Amino acid sequence: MKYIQTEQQIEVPEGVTVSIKSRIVKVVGPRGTLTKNLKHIDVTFTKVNNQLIKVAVHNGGRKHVAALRTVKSLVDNMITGVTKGYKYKMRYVYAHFPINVNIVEKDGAKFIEVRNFLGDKKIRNVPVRDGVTIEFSTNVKDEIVLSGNSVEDVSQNAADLQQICRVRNKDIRKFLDGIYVSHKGFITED
RNA sequence: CAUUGCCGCGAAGCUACCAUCCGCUGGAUUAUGGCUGAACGCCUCUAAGUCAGAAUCCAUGCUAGAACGCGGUGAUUUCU
Ligand SMILES: [Mg+2]
Ligand SMILES: [Mg+2]
Ligand SMILES: [Mg+2]
Ligand SMILES: [Mg+2]
Ligand SMILES: [Mg+2]
Ligand SMILES: [Mg+2]
Ligand SMILES: [Mg+2]
Ligand SMILES: [Mg+2]
Ligand SMILES: [Mg+2]
Ligand SMILES: [Mg+2]
Ligand SMILES: [Mg+2]
């Protein structure tokens, strides 16, 4: 169809600075800073009144309009992640063998070590990505809390811990074992 | 002498899974499982982007070295 103009809104709240040269977006707030290279898209950003940035596609087909609301959602994720921050909570699910996860250092690389998953002698190792801060819940039994600015970094680190603890050669309908994400939320949320 | 006459042992050399030694580790991926995320206010591994991942692939390594591919360097003829 090639719609003439599709357009989206981005609400920049009171503490946030958004800076967009060519298609590289820099979002600065109370929690740090974030950068995305959006040069694969071809949208056009325009600043209206310092609390609002439009993003537009001119003469765009169905897939090109489709990526426009993606670009809105990604910058809003950056804005949320530098104002409220991002926080994931994972619980350990085990039947018989308890799962031992402690935050570990190997050559200054800050891994996550998982011993005794299903009684495996194999120690599993997940590296902590930068920005993600691993926490172990007090007054919740067997909960790991991943916190940081990027929802891309926090959720992929929470994805990597689930993916390393998969169950092999068993019926996974019964062998329900692993570390699963229980909550996707913010840090400064109430 | 017996077309190495025959028999036992027999060094050297060659040799035998009939004897010993030795046979490397990184990256990119497929299937698949994911993250973020629209389309399609929700949902979604996919559309943009991105993670992991096979005995696969491509390197590392190993063999040859273009006899018309290349480089460094040595010496370059007389009482002739
Ligand atoms: Mg599996
Ligand atoms: Mg079986
Ligand atoms: Mg005679
Ligand atoms: Mg004789
Ligand atoms: Mg052999
Ligand atoms: Mg999802
Ligand atoms: Mg895939
Ligand atoms: Mg894709
Ligand atoms: Mg990958
Ligand atoms: Mg190598
Ligand atoms: Mg040659």
PDB file of C-alpha atoms (C1' of nucleotides) and ligand atoms in Angstrom:
ATOM      1  CA  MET A   1       0.000   0.000   0.000  1.00  0.00           C
ATOM      2  CA  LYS A   2       2.917   2.282   0.940  1.00  0.00           C
ATOM      3  CA  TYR A   3       1.336   4.536   3.557  1.00  0.00           C
ATOM      4  CA  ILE A   4       2.277   8.208   3.135  1.00  0.00           C
ATOM      5  CA  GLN A   5       3.279   8.815   6.725  1.00  0.00           C
ATOM      6  CA  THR A   6       3.177   6.600   9.784  1.00  0.00           C
ATOM      7  CA  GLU A   7       4.280   8.180  13.027  1.00  0.00           C
ATOM      8  CA  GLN A   8       4.817   7.303  16.691  1.00  0.00           C
ATOM      9  CA  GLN A   9       5.214   9.195  19.977  1.00  0.00           C
ATOM     10  CA  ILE A  10       7.972   8.893  22.577  1.00  0.00           C
ATOM     11  CA  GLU A  11       7.340  10.472  25.982  1.00  0.00           C
ATOM     12  CA  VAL A  12      10.603  11.697  27.509  1.00  0.00           C
ATOM     13  CA  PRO A  13       9.919  12.277  31.228  1.00  0.00           C
ATOM     14  CA  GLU A  14      11.240  15.019  33.445  1.00  0.00           C
ATOM     15  CA  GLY A  15      14.738  13.743  34.195  1.00  0.00           C
ATOM     16  CA  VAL A  16      15.735  12.105  30.922  1.00  0.00           C
ATOM     17  CA  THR A  17      17.990  13.452  28.173  1.00  0.00           C
ATOM     18  CA  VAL A  18      17.670  11.818  24.752  1.00  0.00           C
ATOM     19  CA  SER A  19      20.275  12.625  22.103  1.00  0.00           C
ATOM     20  CA  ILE A  20      19.921  11.376  18.514  1.00  0.00           C
ATOM     21  CA  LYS A  21      22.592  12.036  15.920  1.00  0.00           C
ATOM     22  CA  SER A  22      22.438  10.072  12.809  1.00  0.00           C
ATOM     23  CA  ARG A  23      20.434   7.113  14.005  1.00  0.00           C
ATOM     24  CA  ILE A  24      22.408   6.510  17.199  1.00  0.00           C
ATOM     25  CA  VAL A  25      20.253   7.067  20.259  1.00  0.00           C
ATOM     26  CA  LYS A  26      21.784   8.102  23.577  1.00  0.00           C
ATOM     27  CA  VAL A  27      19.455   8.107  26.576  1.00  0.00           C
ATOM     28  CA  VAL A  28      20.742   9.597  29.843  1.00  0.00           C
ATOM     29  CA  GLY A  29      18.857   9.546  33.130  1.00  0.00           C
ATOM     30  CA  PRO A  30      19.144   9.078  36.901  1.00  0.00           C
ATOM     31  CA  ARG A  31      20.442   5.496  36.572  1.00  0.00           C
ATOM     32  CA  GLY A  32      23.197   5.768  34.003  1.00  0.00           C
ATOM     33  CA  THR A  33      23.228   5.890  30.225  1.00  0.00           C
ATOM     34  CA  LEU A  34      22.266   3.739  27.258  1.00  0.00           C
ATOM     35  CA  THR A  35      23.188   3.663  23.584  1.00  0.00           C
ATOM     36  CA  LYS A  36      21.560   2.011  20.591  1.00  0.00           C
ATOM     37  CA  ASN A  37      22.653   2.015  16.965  1.00  0.00           C
ATOM     38  CA  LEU A  38      19.350   2.092  15.089  1.00  0.00           C
ATOM     39  CA  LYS A  39      20.983   2.442  11.684  1.00  0.00           C
ATOM     40  CA  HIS A  40      19.371  -0.737  10.302  1.00  0.00           C
ATOM     41  CA  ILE A  41      15.834   0.679  10.182  1.00  0.00           C
ATOM     42  CA  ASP A  42      15.525   4.006   8.245  1.00  0.00           C
ATOM     43  CA  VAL A  43      13.173   5.950  10.490  1.00  0.00           C
ATOM     44  CA  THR A  44      13.322   9.682  11.167  1.00  0.00           C
ATOM     45  CA  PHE A  45      13.288  11.081  14.693  1.00  0.00           C
ATOM     46  CA  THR A  46      12.155  14.605  15.430  1.00  0.00           C
ATOM     47  CA  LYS A  47      12.035  16.481  18.722  1.00  0.00           C
ATOM     48  CA  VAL A  48       8.876  18.397  19.494  1.00  0.00           C
ATOM     49  CA  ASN A  49       8.954  20.047  22.891  1.00  0.00           C
ATOM     50  CA  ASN A  50      11.707  18.417  25.082  1.00  0.00           C
ATOM     51  CA  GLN A  51       9.166  16.002  26.608  1.00  0.00           C
ATOM     52  CA  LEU A  52       8.254  14.320  23.323  1.00  0.00           C
ATOM     53  CA  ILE A  53      10.060  12.864  20.322  1.00  0.00           C
ATOM     54  CA  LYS A  54       8.218  11.711  17.230  1.00  0.00           C
ATOM     55  CA  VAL A  55       9.494   8.944  14.989  1.00  0.00           C
ATOM     56  CA  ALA A  56       8.232   8.689  11.435  1.00  0.00           C
ATOM     57  CA  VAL A  57       8.275   6.585   8.283  1.00  0.00           C
ATOM     58  CA  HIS A  58       7.599   8.283   4.949  1.00  0.00           C
ATOM     59  CA  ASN A  59       6.302   6.116   2.077  1.00  0.00           C
ATOM     60  CA  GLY A  60       6.536   2.871   4.006  1.00  0.00           C
ATOM     61  CA  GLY A  61       5.275  -0.587   3.196  1.00  0.00           C
ATOM     62  CA  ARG A  62       3.770  -3.014   5.676  1.00  0.00           C
ATOM     63  CA  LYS A  63       7.066  -4.326   7.020  1.00  0.00           C
ATOM     64  CA  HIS A  64       8.563  -0.837   7.208  1.00  0.00           C
ATOM     65  CA  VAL A  65       5.573   0.427   9.185  1.00  0.00           C
ATOM     66  CA  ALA A  66       5.920  -2.713  11.333  1.00  0.00           C
ATOM     67  CA  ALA A  67       9.440  -1.785  12.396  1.00  0.00           C
ATOM     68  CA  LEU A  68       8.379   1.728  13.402  1.00  0.00           C
ATOM     69  CA  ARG A  69       6.503   0.699  16.545  1.00  0.00           C
ATOM     70  CA  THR A  70       9.443  -1.587  17.338  1.00  0.00           C
ATOM     71  CA  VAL A  71      11.735   1.454  17.310  1.00  0.00           C
ATOM     72  CA  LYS A  72       9.288   3.276  19.592  1.00  0.00           C
ATOM     73  CA  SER A  73       9.260   0.321  21.966  1.00  0.00           C
ATOM     74  CA  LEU A  74      13.041  -0.023  22.068  1.00  0.00           C
ATOM     75  CA  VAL A  75      13.706   3.633  22.906  1.00  0.00           C
ATOM     76  CA  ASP A  76      10.941   3.492  25.525  1.00  0.00           C
ATOM     77  CA  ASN A  77      12.701   0.437  26.944  1.00  0.00           C
ATOM     78  CA  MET A  78      15.899   2.496  27.091  1.00  0.00           C
ATOM     79  CA  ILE A  79      14.034   5.347  28.795  1.00  0.00           C
ATOM     80  CA  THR A  80      12.393   3.037  31.327  1.00  0.00           C
ATOM     81  CA  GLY A  81      15.689   1.289  31.971  1.00  0.00           C
ATOM     82  CA  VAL A  82      17.530   4.491  32.826  1.00  0.00           C
ATOM     83  CA  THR A  83      14.721   5.977  34.938  1.00  0.00           C
ATOM     84  CA  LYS A  84      13.144   2.991  36.692  1.00  0.00           C
ATOM     85  CA  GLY A  85      15.669   0.308  35.726  1.00  0.00           C
ATOM     86  CA  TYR A  86      14.934  -3.329  34.980  1.00  0.00           C
ATOM     87  CA  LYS A  87      14.665  -6.254  37.372  1.00  0.00           C
ATOM     88  CA  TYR A  88      14.041  -9.942  36.768  1.00  0.00           C
ATOM     89  CA  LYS A  89      13.374 -12.626  39.362  1.00  0.00           C
ATOM     90  CA  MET A  90      14.043 -16.303  38.802  1.00  0.00           C
ATOM     91  CA  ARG A  91      13.178 -19.203  41.088  1.00  0.00           C
ATOM     92  CA  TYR A  92      14.879 -22.596  41.180  1.00  0.00           C
ATOM     93  CA  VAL A  93      12.626 -25.556  40.452  1.00  0.00           C
ATOM     94  CA  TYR A  94      13.896 -28.879  41.696  1.00  0.00           C
ATOM     95  CA  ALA A  95      12.374 -32.182  42.696  1.00  0.00           C
ATOM     96  CA  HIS A  96      15.135 -34.001  44.580  1.00  0.00           C
ATOM     97  CA  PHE A  97      18.611 -32.515  44.079  1.00  0.00           C
ATOM     98  CA  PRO A  98      18.884 -28.920  45.341  1.00  0.00           C
ATOM     99  CA  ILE A  99      20.510 -26.463  42.948  1.00  0.00           C
ATOM    100  CA  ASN A 100      23.523 -24.522  44.208  1.00  0.00           C
ATOM    101  CA  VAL A 101      24.012 -21.164  42.508  1.00  0.00           C
ATOM    102  CA  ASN A 102      26.605 -18.753  43.885  1.00  0.00           C
ATOM    103  CA  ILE A 103      28.109 -15.667  42.284  1.00  0.00           C
ATOM    104  CA  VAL A 104      31.680 -16.530  41.380  1.00  0.00           C
ATOM    105  CA  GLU A 105      34.796 -14.903  39.953  1.00  0.00           C
ATOM    106  CA  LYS A 106      36.949 -16.637  37.348  1.00  0.00           C
ATOM    107  CA  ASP A 107      39.881 -14.474  36.164  1.00  0.00           C
ATOM    108  CA  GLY A 108      37.979 -11.255  36.805  1.00  0.00           C
ATOM    109  CA  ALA A 109      35.140 -12.217  34.478  1.00  0.00           C
ATOM    110  CA  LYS A 110      32.282 -12.533  37.043  1.00  0.00           C
ATOM    111  CA  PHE A 111      30.584 -15.837  36.247  1.00  0.00           C
ATOM    112  CA  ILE A 112      27.543 -17.550  37.738  1.00  0.00           C
ATOM    113  CA  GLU A 113      28.292 -21.102  38.831  1.00  0.00           C
ATOM    114  CA  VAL A 114      25.548 -23.730  38.997  1.00  0.00           C
ATOM    115  CA  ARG A 115      26.422 -26.921  40.840  1.00  0.00           C
ATOM    116  CA  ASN A 116      24.246 -29.989  41.434  1.00  0.00           C
ATOM    117  CA  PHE A 117      21.683 -29.381  38.728  1.00  0.00           C
ATOM    118  CA  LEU A 118      19.986 -32.828  38.691  1.00  0.00           C
ATOM    119  CA  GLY A 119      22.950 -34.230  40.564  1.00  0.00           C
ATOM    120  CA  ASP A 120      25.329 -33.404  37.745  1.00  0.00           C
ATOM    121  CA  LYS A 121      28.954 -33.234  38.778  1.00  0.00           C
ATOM    122  CA  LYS A 122      29.310 -30.784  35.881  1.00  0.00           C
ATOM    123  CA  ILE A 123      29.583 -27.215  37.092  1.00  0.00           C
ATOM    124  CA  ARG A 124      27.663 -24.943  34.749  1.00  0.00           C
ATOM    125  CA  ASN A 125      28.969 -21.429  34.152  1.00  0.00           C
ATOM    126  CA  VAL A 126      27.016 -18.368  33.027  1.00  0.00           C
ATOM    127  CA  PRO A 127      28.913 -15.093  32.575  1.00  0.00           C
ATOM    128  CA  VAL A 128      27.313 -11.981  33.991  1.00  0.00           C
ATOM    129  CA  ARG A 129      26.894  -9.372  31.286  1.00  0.00           C
ATOM    130  CA  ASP A 130      27.926  -5.827  32.155  1.00  0.00           C
ATOM    131  CA  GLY A 131      25.304  -3.684  33.842  1.00  0.00           C
ATOM    132  CA  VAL A 132      23.434  -6.730  35.075  1.00  0.00           C
ATOM    133  CA  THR A 133      23.759  -7.034  38.838  1.00  0.00           C
ATOM    134  CA  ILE A 134      23.049 -10.462  40.274  1.00  0.00           C
ATOM    135  CA  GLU A 135      21.365 -10.626  43.676  1.00  0.00           C
ATOM    136  CA  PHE A 136      20.182 -13.534  45.821  1.00  0.00           C
ATOM    137  CA  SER A 137      16.846 -13.054  47.522  1.00  0.00           C
ATOM    138  CA  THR A 138      16.565 -12.910  51.284  1.00  0.00           C
ATOM    139  CA  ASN A 139      13.108 -13.865  52.657  1.00  0.00           C
ATOM    140  CA  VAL A 140      12.377 -15.662  49.391  1.00  0.00           C
ATOM    141  CA  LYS A 141      13.606 -19.237  49.184  1.00  0.00           C
ATOM    142  CA  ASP A 142      15.813 -20.003  46.182  1.00  0.00           C
ATOM    143  CA  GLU A 143      15.363 -16.826  44.146  1.00  0.00           C
ATOM    144  CA  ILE A 144      17.966 -15.054  42.001  1.00  0.00           C
ATOM    145  CA  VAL A 145      17.397 -11.396  41.093  1.00  0.00           C
ATOM    146  CA  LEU A 146      18.983  -9.855  37.990  1.00  0.00           C
ATOM    147  CA  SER A 147      19.026  -6.060  37.908  1.00  0.00           C
ATOM    148  CA  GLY A 148      20.359  -3.494  35.498  1.00  0.00           C
ATOM    149  CA  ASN A 149      19.684  -0.791  32.958  1.00  0.00           C
ATOM    150  CA  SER A 150      19.272  -2.684  29.699  1.00  0.00           C
ATOM    151  CA  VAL A 151      16.267  -4.960  29.374  1.00  0.00           C
ATOM    152  CA  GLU A 152      18.237  -6.514  26.522  1.00  0.00           C
ATOM    153  CA  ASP A 153      21.162  -7.345  28.804  1.00  0.00           C
ATOM    154  CA  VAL A 154      19.106  -8.288  31.878  1.00  0.00           C
ATOM    155  CA  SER A 155      16.684 -10.597  30.104  1.00  0.00           C
ATOM    156  CA  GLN A 156      19.337 -12.293  27.967  1.00  0.00           C
ATOM    157  CA  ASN A 157      21.384 -12.971  31.088  1.00  0.00           C
ATOM    158  CA  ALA A 158      18.225 -14.365  32.648  1.00  0.00           C
ATOM    159  CA  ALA A 159      17.685 -16.278  29.430  1.00  0.00           C
ATOM    160  CA  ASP A 160      21.198 -17.714  29.563  1.00  0.00           C
ATOM    161  CA  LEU A 161      20.760 -19.054  33.089  1.00  0.00           C
ATOM    162  CA  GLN A 162      17.576 -20.853  32.083  1.00  0.00           C
ATOM    163  CA  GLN A 163      19.120 -22.178  28.880  1.00  0.00           C
ATOM    164  CA  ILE A 164      22.161 -23.661  30.621  1.00  0.00           C
ATOM    165  CA  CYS A 165      19.897 -25.618  33.026  1.00  0.00           C
ATOM    166  CA  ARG A 166      17.957 -27.575  30.434  1.00  0.00           C
ATOM    167  CA  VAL A 167      17.096 -31.209  31.082  1.00  0.00           C
ATOM    168  CA  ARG A 168      18.572 -33.795  28.726  1.00  0.00           C
ATOM    169  CA  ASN A 169      17.227 -37.209  27.680  1.00  0.00           C
ATOM    170  CA  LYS A 170      14.272 -37.083  30.085  1.00  0.00           C
ATOM    171  CA  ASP A 171      10.570 -36.308  29.885  1.00  0.00           C
ATOM    172  CA  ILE A 172      10.476 -32.594  30.681  1.00  0.00           C
ATOM    173  CA  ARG A 173       6.785 -32.802  31.586  1.00  0.00           C
ATOM    174  CA  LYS A 174       7.859 -34.606  34.767  1.00  0.00           C
ATOM    175  CA  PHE A 175      11.513 -33.568  35.049  1.00  0.00           C
ATOM    176  CA  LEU A 176      10.404 -29.974  35.510  1.00  0.00           C
ATOM    177  CA  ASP A 177      13.826 -28.988  36.755  1.00  0.00           C
ATOM    178  CA  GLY A 178      15.672 -25.733  36.283  1.00  0.00           C
ATOM    179  CA  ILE A 179      15.792 -22.011  36.936  1.00  0.00           C
ATOM    180  CA  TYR A 180      12.766 -20.289  35.427  1.00  0.00           C
ATOM    181  CA  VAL A 181      11.932 -16.586  35.167  1.00  0.00           C
ATOM    182  CA  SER A 182       9.129 -15.755  37.572  1.00  0.00           C
ATOM    183  CA  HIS A 183       8.813 -11.996  37.320  1.00  0.00           C
ATOM    184  CA  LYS A 184       9.711  -9.308  34.798  1.00  0.00           C
ATOM    185  CA  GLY A 185       9.549  -5.940  36.498  1.00  0.00           C
ATOM    186  CA  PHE A 186      11.236  -2.676  37.344  1.00  0.00           C
ATOM    187  CA  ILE A 187      13.671  -1.737  40.072  1.00  0.00           C
ATOM    188  CA  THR A 188      12.113   1.471  41.432  1.00  0.00           C
ATOM    189  CA  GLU A 189       8.576   0.156  41.083  1.00  0.00           C
ATOM    190  CA  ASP A 190       5.823   0.381  43.676  1.00  0.00           C
TER     191      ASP A 190
ATOM    192  C1'   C B   1      81.985 -79.102  -6.682  1.00  0.00           C
ATOM    193  C1'   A B   2      76.652 -80.449  -5.375  1.00  0.00           C
ATOM    194  C1'   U B   3      72.799 -74.125 -10.274  1.00  0.00           C
ATOM    195  C1'   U B   4      73.004 -70.422  -2.453  1.00  0.00           C
ATOM    196  C1'   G B   5      74.441 -78.953  -1.292  1.00  0.00           C
ATOM    197  C1'   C B   6      71.972 -79.444   3.668  1.00  0.00           C
ATOM    198  C1'   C B   7      71.552 -78.232   9.202  1.00  0.00           C
ATOM    199  C1'   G B   8      72.023 -74.908  13.816  1.00  0.00           C
ATOM    200  C1'   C B   9      73.100 -70.124  15.338  1.00  0.00           C
ATOM    201  C1'   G B  10      73.716 -65.720  12.930  1.00  0.00           C
ATOM    202  C1'   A B  11      75.285 -59.362  13.089  1.00  0.00           C
ATOM    203  C1'   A B  12      73.772 -55.266   9.725  1.00  0.00           C
ATOM    204  C1'   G B  13      69.710 -53.704   6.892  1.00  0.00           C
ATOM    205  C1'   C B  14      64.607 -54.143   5.858  1.00  0.00           C
ATOM    206  C1'   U B  15      60.379 -55.223   8.394  1.00  0.00           C
ATOM    207  C1'   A B  16      55.455 -56.746  11.467  1.00  0.00           C
ATOM    208  C1'   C B  17      48.729 -54.219  15.219  1.00  0.00           C
ATOM    209  C1'   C B  18      53.562 -60.143  15.188  1.00  0.00           C
ATOM    210  C1'   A B  19      56.971 -54.557  17.737  1.00  0.00           C
ATOM    211  C1'   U B  20      56.776 -49.490  19.846  1.00  0.00           C
ATOM    212  C1'   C B  21      55.508 -44.080  19.677  1.00  0.00           C
ATOM    213  C1'   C B  22      52.306 -40.196  18.040  1.00  0.00           C
ATOM    214  C1'   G B  23      47.414 -38.377  15.872  1.00  0.00           C
ATOM    215  C1'   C B  24      45.854 -30.191  17.750  1.00  0.00           C
ATOM    216  C1'   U B  25      42.020 -26.210  19.269  1.00  0.00           C
ATOM    217  C1'   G B  26      39.462 -21.695  17.956  1.00  0.00           C
ATOM    218  C1'   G B  27      35.796 -19.202  15.262  1.00  0.00           C
ATOM    219  C1'   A B  28      30.923 -19.239  12.075  1.00  0.00           C
ATOM    220  C1'   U B  29      26.712 -21.887  11.576  1.00  0.00           C
ATOM    221  C1'   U B  30      22.200 -26.018  10.544  1.00  0.00           C
ATOM    222  C1'   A B  31      18.153 -28.430  13.249  1.00  0.00           C
ATOM    223  C1'   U B  32      16.532 -26.662  17.703  1.00  0.00           C
ATOM    224  C1'   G B  33      15.807 -23.890  22.141  1.00  0.00           C
ATOM    225  C1'   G B  34      15.791 -18.467  23.452  1.00  0.00           C
ATOM    226  C1'   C B  35      15.864 -12.797  24.372  1.00  0.00           C
ATOM    227  C1'   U B  36      13.865  -8.202  22.987  1.00  0.00           C
ATOM    228  C1'   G B  37       9.857  -6.912  19.792  1.00  0.00           C
ATOM    229  C1'   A B  38       6.142  -5.113  16.308  1.00  0.00           C
ATOM    230  C1'   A B  39       2.860  -6.480  12.570  1.00  0.00           C
ATOM    231  C1'   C B  40      -2.206  -7.471  15.077  1.00  0.00           C
ATOM    232  C1'   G B  41      -2.772  -1.732  21.727  1.00  0.00           C
ATOM    233  C1'   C B  42      -2.740  -8.486  23.555  1.00  0.00           C
ATOM    234  C1'   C B  43       0.272 -12.468  22.110  1.00  0.00           C
ATOM    235  C1'   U B  44       4.518 -14.007  19.369  1.00  0.00           C
ATOM    236  C1'   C B  45      12.270 -16.862  18.621  1.00  0.00           C
ATOM    237  C1'   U B  46      11.257 -12.711  13.486  1.00  0.00           C
ATOM    238  C1'   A B  47       9.334  -9.009  10.558  1.00  0.00           C
ATOM    239  C1'   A B  48      14.060  -5.101  12.195  1.00  0.00           C
ATOM    240  C1'   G B  49      17.719  -6.552  15.874  1.00  0.00           C
ATOM    241  C1'   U B  50      19.987 -10.321  18.830  1.00  0.00           C
ATOM    242  C1'   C B  51      21.638 -15.205  22.260  1.00  0.00           C
ATOM    243  C1'   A B  52      23.053 -20.232  22.434  1.00  0.00           C
ATOM    244  C1'   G B  53      23.995 -24.321  19.473  1.00  0.00           C
ATOM    245  C1'   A B  54      25.684 -30.585  15.323  1.00  0.00           C
ATOM    246  C1'   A B  55      30.410 -35.507  14.296  1.00  0.00           C
ATOM    247  C1'   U B  56      28.648 -29.671   9.847  1.00  0.00           C
ATOM    248  C1'   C B  57      31.638 -25.433   7.702  1.00  0.00           C
ATOM    249  C1'   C B  58      35.915 -22.316   7.846  1.00  0.00           C
ATOM    250  C1'   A B  59      40.378 -21.396  10.091  1.00  0.00           C
ATOM    251  C1'   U B  60      44.650 -23.043  13.652  1.00  0.00           C
ATOM    252  C1'   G B  61      47.717 -27.164  12.712  1.00  0.00           C
ATOM    253  C1'   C B  62      49.654 -30.812   9.011  1.00  0.00           C
ATOM    254  C1'   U B  63      51.477 -31.843   3.367  1.00  0.00           C
ATOM    255  C1'   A B  64      53.069 -29.815  -1.262  1.00  0.00           C
ATOM    256  C1'   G B  65      54.732 -25.043  -2.844  1.00  0.00           C
ATOM    257  C1'   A B  66      52.798 -21.440  -8.528  1.00  0.00           C
ATOM    258  C1'   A B  67      58.590 -25.327 -12.031  1.00  0.00           C
ATOM    259  C1'   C B  68      55.710 -17.797 -16.080  1.00  0.00           C
ATOM    260  C1'   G B  69      53.888 -15.718  -7.614  1.00  0.00           C
ATOM    261  C1'   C B  70      56.846 -12.906  -4.188  1.00  0.00           C
ATOM    262  C1'   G B  71      60.686 -11.210  -0.388  1.00  0.00           C
ATOM    263  C1'   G B  72      65.478 -10.949   2.683  1.00  0.00           C
ATOM    264  C1'   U B  73      70.646 -11.773   2.260  1.00  0.00           C
ATOM    265  C1'   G B  74      75.999 -13.346   0.700  1.00  0.00           C
ATOM    266  C1'   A B  75      79.565 -13.156  -3.138  1.00  0.00           C
ATOM    267  C1'   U B  76      79.911 -11.447  -7.833  1.00  0.00           C
ATOM    268  C1'   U B  77      85.685 -13.339 -12.593  1.00  0.00           C
ATOM    269  C1'   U B  78      91.883  -8.220 -15.407  1.00  0.00           C
ATOM    270  C1'   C B  79      97.458  -9.236 -14.828  1.00  0.00           C
ATOM    271  C1'   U B  80      92.383 -13.007 -17.759  1.00  0.00           C
TER     272        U B  80
HETATM  273 MG    MG C   1      17.779 -30.260  25.514  1.00  0.00          MG
HETATM  274 MG    MG C   2      14.702 -42.829  28.078  1.00  0.00          MG
HETATM  275 MG    MG C   3      85.159 -79.536 -10.933  1.00  0.00          MG
HETATM  276 MG    MG C   4      79.447 -75.371  -2.849  1.00  0.00          MG
HETATM  277 MG    MG C   5      48.475 -49.204  13.644  1.00  0.00          MG
HETATM  278 MG    MG C   6       8.751 -12.706  24.590  1.00  0.00          MG
HETATM  279 MG    MG C   7      16.498 -19.358  14.738  1.00  0.00          MG
HETATM  280 MG    MG C   8      15.462 -12.193  11.905  1.00  0.00          MG
HETATM  281 MG    MG C   9      25.334 -16.504  18.751  1.00  0.00          MG
HETATM  282 MG    MG C  10      42.990 -22.043  16.403  1.00  0.00          MG
HETATM  283 MG    MG C  11      58.386 -21.429  -6.321  1.00  0.00          MG
END
